[PDB]
Amino acid sequence: TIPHLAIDPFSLDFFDDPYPDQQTLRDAGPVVYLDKWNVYGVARYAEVHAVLNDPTTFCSSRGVGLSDFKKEKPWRPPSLILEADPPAHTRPRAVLSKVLSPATMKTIRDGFAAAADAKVDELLQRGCIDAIADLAEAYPLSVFPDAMGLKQEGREHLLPYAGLVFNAFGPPNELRQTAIERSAPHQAYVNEQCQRPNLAPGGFGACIHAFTDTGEITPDEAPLLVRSLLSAGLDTTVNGIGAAVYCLARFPGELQRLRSDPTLARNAFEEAVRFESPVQTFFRTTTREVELGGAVIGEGEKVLMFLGSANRDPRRWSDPDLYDITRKTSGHVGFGSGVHMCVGQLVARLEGEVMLSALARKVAAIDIDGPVKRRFNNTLRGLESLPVKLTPA
Ligand code: HEM
Ligand SMILES: CNc1cccc(C(=O)O)c1
Ligand SMILES: [Cl-]
């Protein structure tokens, strides 16, 4: 009943151009079986959304990568939030909600915006830049480690550690094997910065530890929740901002609309998250036999959700392959959906908005002027190098 496909969604060929194979996955049926990895797949918006919003049946505590924690040891202690189900998920999630809360964004917005403006001014002095290293990476590195409260020394470990984490959700291919091989120094640095004395007053890390006397988390839970922010909160924004700049470079008509109304900055970033979907995929594990889109899936089965494909599904979106900064983007799954929906989405949107605002006010044109190089990761989609010429307004 279920179609079986040989597509490997973690192969370099797939990463290089995933869109034809994603249509093949959507059009084969609402539920597919991927023979390469012995998992079920859902690539249409409807089934991805249904799976995300039934965490009882499609759980996260057996891992959101290919590995089933019931069968194999996790490569690092499980995340207390990403790799937990309700009710154990609920109180740590509430603490991160409050640490990254609507009210908290007010304390950081002025500094994030000034750093975004300063970066664009600096880049305009050079003219020809790499929008990945010099913008998408440089800007979050200039604000997020400080907002965490990290010391200066050792920050070079942060992007390698996060790349490792996201590669580790994948199957045991060479990308994953090599990441884990190189992991020991980055793991050591990150685990050490998660301890209370190493997190500067007023930053996100200190605020997590401060919640350990409310009864929502205990002191021994705080370091792993800091670990969540250091795993999840930097590389994702790098690829989100990189996606937005790549979109503006490829769709100059949309840059022109953004210049004419810079208040579109927040939605231009949200549309870039839909359009590129920096986090491409996550798994769930079934806790019972279940009917999904007509198919019967047994207990204990891994289900691969194609978030990027769901965000391009023509059953849900008009002209899904167009970048449209006034699109009604509500309901895209680039941040997930439901109880695990990205707890840092307000930080991500703040960074994206203020960077696109700086570009909207200061730049007249963004022209690719060198070879574009893709970066390969089992979970993240983004570029390694994006040479652009920035023309000043
Ligand atoms: C463009 C940037 C980002 C994207 C595309 C993104 C994507 C996602 C997605 C798809 C999920 C859901 C995972 C699932 O359902 O299993 C998620 C959850 C999460 N995100 Fe983000 N994220 C971004 C930025 C951030 C930032 C800036 C932070 C922290 C400062 C962060 C921290 C987290 C955490 C801790 C979770 C787990 C939440 C839970 O399990 O309840 N993320 N993110
Ligand atoms: C998607 N969000 C995410 C990614 C990687 C790690 C974690 C974590 O909680 O460690 C969360
Ligand atoms: Cl680790």
Automatic annotation (TrEMBL):
<keyword id="KW-0560">Oxidoreductase</keyword>
<keyword id="KW-0479">Metal-binding</keyword>
<dbReference type="GO" id="GO:0005506">
    <property type="term" value="F:iron ion binding"/>
</dbReference>
<protein>
    <submittedName>
        <fullName>Cytochrome P450</fullName>
    </submittedName>
</protein>
<dbReference type="InterPro" id="IPR001128">
    <property type="entry name" value="Cyt_P450"/>
</dbReference>
<feature type="binding site">
    <location>
        <position position="284"/>
    </location>
    <ligand>
        <name>heme b</name>
    </ligand>
</feature>
<feature type="binding site">
    <location>
        <position position="340"/>
    </location>
    <ligand>
        <name>heme b</name>
    </ligand>
</feature>
<keyword id="KW-0349">Heme</keyword>
<feature type="binding site">
    <location>
        <position position="342"/>
    </location>
    <ligand>
        <name>heme b</name>
    </ligand>
</feature>
<keyword id="KW-0408">Iron</keyword>
<dbReference type="GO" id="GO:0016705">
    <property type="term" value="F:oxidoreductase activity, acting on paired donors, with incorporation or reduction of molecular oxygen"/>
</dbReference>
<comment type="similarity">
    <text>Belongs to the cytochrome P450 family.</text>
</comment>
<keyword id="KW-0503">Monooxygenase</keyword>
<dbReference type="InterPro" id="IPR036396">
    <property type="entry name" value="Cyt_P450_sf"/>
</dbReference>
<dbReference type="GO" id="GO:0020037">
    <property type="term" value="F:heme binding"/>
</dbReference>
<dbReference type="InterPro" id="IPR017972">
    <property type="entry name" value="Cyt_P450_CS"/>
</dbReference>
<dbReference type="GO" id="GO:0004497">
    <property type="term" value="F:monooxygenase activity"/>
</dbReference>
<dbReference type="Pfam" id="PF00067">
    <property type="entry name" value="p450"/>
</dbReference>
<feature type="binding site">
    <location>
        <position position="89"/>
    </location>
    <ligand>
        <name>heme b</name>
    </ligand>
</feature>
<feature type="binding site">
    <location>
        <position position="93"/>
    </location>
    <ligand>
        <name>heme b</name>
    </ligand>
</feature>
<dbReference type="InterPro" id="IPR002397">
    <property type="entry name" value="Cyt_P450_B"/>
</dbReference>
